[PDB]
Amino acid sequence: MLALGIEGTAHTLGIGIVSEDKVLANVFDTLTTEKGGIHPKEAAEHHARLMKPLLRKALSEAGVSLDDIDVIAFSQGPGLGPALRVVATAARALAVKYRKPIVGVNHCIAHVEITKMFGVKDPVGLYVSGGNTQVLALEGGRYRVFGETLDIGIGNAIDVFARELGLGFPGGPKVEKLAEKGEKYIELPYAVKGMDLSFSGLLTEAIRKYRSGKYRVEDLAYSFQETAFAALVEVTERAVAHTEKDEVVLVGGVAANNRLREMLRIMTEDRGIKFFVPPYDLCRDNGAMIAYTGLRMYKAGISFRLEETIVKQKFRTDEVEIVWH
Ligand SMILES: Nc1ncnc2c1ncn2[C@@H]1O[C@H](COP(=O)(O)OP(=O)(O)NP(=O)(O)O)[C@@H](O)[C@H]1O
Ligand SMILES: [Mg+2]
């Protein structure tokens, strides 16, 4: 079977075409934000403009027509209202025109679910991006969020720090490079708050220390990563300990980070459990993960009525019953 998926919760418009076993197409266009920040209205304009060209490119690279597609899937939420609405409108339009069933997909769930195409069965997921940071795992028939950010996503925290230092968007790779050159740990506030993550205190302290001129920038970048990532690993490990699951996945745009990967490898190896990171075009915001999750939902008998396709800006991860597992 084939599914077409449209992702557009934030600045990236992604269209994917997948089967149960493989990705046939995975195409991208991201709104250029040279000075970072969140731009919901510009993202919406971008998605609407790029919808037709990207759909054409996805169909060409997959080598199929829209008549070959079994189900249309879209990122229903959570995310930016104007951007979500463009995506949902486009998906509904395709569904009506080609008389296809439609499914709304939770963006956070999709990030974890895509790993199951690669043989992952039942993982603790660490989902880390610009605006999102969640540790999630299947419990009681739903994805339970064990810990999440109370303020800003780790990606955004790094992006703000980068901007302060004169490193333009995206900040992540640039801060990662600086961190590799660090040779001294500088004490910074720990980012675990109860079960959850909190990065605002860490970020503001790092900026204050930067403005003091007392430290090497590379040492601050190194310390920022060591502190923030150690927190991520702790929350992930706690979830593993409780759930007794034997695999961890790292997903989201921040999954590109080699240091974070290394820290998770160490933790999983010490526990004697598996660790997996999908190819990066399936880690960052993409349409293929939407297509795959949507297909699994459809095969489980899920098919949305029109009023069920209304966007959910604050879509909670635990709302969806995972009946396809
Ligand atoms: N090597 C890296 N280390 C740390 N952060 C990174 C790295 N590469 C990318 N990032 C961050 O990942 C984020 C981009 O992720 P991407 O999924 O492309 O968009 P997004 O809007 O953050 N996704 P979402 O929040 O899930 O809608 C940015 O904050 C980047 O700085
Ligand atoms: Mg992402």
Side-chain angles (χ1 to χ4, degrees), residues 1-213:
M1 295 178 77
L2 293 171
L4 194 142
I6 308 169
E7 157 67 30
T9 60
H11 299 148
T12 297
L13 184 67
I15 300 166
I17 297 166
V18 305
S19 64
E20 295 93 333
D21 309 79
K22 66 195 280 284
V23 178
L24 284 80
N26 195 19
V27 297
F28 301 88
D29 201 290
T30 306
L31 173 75
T32 304
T33 57
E34 288 296 317
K35 277 80 184 176
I38 306 301
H39 302 90
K41 295 174 286 294
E42 284 181 37
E45 292 180 47
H46 167 276
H47 299 352
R49 195 199 314 137
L50 269 293
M51 194 66 67
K52 281 181 187 285
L54 275 190
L55 191 64
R56 199 184 311 114
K57 187 180 176 179
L59 291 160
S60 180
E61 290 190 1
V64 292
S65 71
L66 286 149
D67 289 309
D68 301 316
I69 303 297
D70 291 283
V71 63
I72 291 155
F74 72 98
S75 61
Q76 190 168 17
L80 311 176
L84 288 170
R85 289 191 293 274
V86 168
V87 168
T89 303
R92 285 189 286 261
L94 289 169
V96 171
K97 191 178 177 185
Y98 296 94
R99 302 165 309 277
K100 303 293 176 177
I102 186 164
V103 288
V105 181
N106 180 290
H107 176 83
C108 309
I109 291 171
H111 272 288
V112 175
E113 283 284 305
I114 189 65
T115 65
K116 304 199 176 191
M117 191 190 283
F118 298 86
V120 180
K121 304 292 172 185
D122 189 14
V124 170
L126 176 56
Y127 165 43
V128 280
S129 69
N132 298 133
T133 294
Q134 291 191 330
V135 172
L136 63 162
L138 288 175
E139 183 182 283
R142 287 158 281 278
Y143 273 100
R144 177 181 162 194
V145 178
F146 287 84
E148 66 184 310
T149 182
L150 297 174
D151 37 44
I152 53 182
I154 186 55
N156 182 55
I158 298 163
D159 291 336
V160 173
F161 185 61
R163 184 163 64 240
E164 173 73 15
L165 272 47
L167 281 42
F169 189 87
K174 297 176 185 70
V175 167
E176 192 189 353
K177 175 62 189 188
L178 285 187
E180 291 174 356
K181 304 172 78 67
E183 67 194 2
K184 193 189 294 295
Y185 180 73
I186 304 156
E187 22 69 277
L188 291 168
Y190 199 47
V192 175
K193 196 173 188 172
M195 291 297 288
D196 294 304
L197 292 312
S198 182
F199 302 117
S200 192
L202 169 64
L203 173 61
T204 58
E205 180 67 42
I207 291 166
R208 287 194 298 274
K209 292 203 173 218
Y210 171 69
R211 292 184 185 179
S212 80

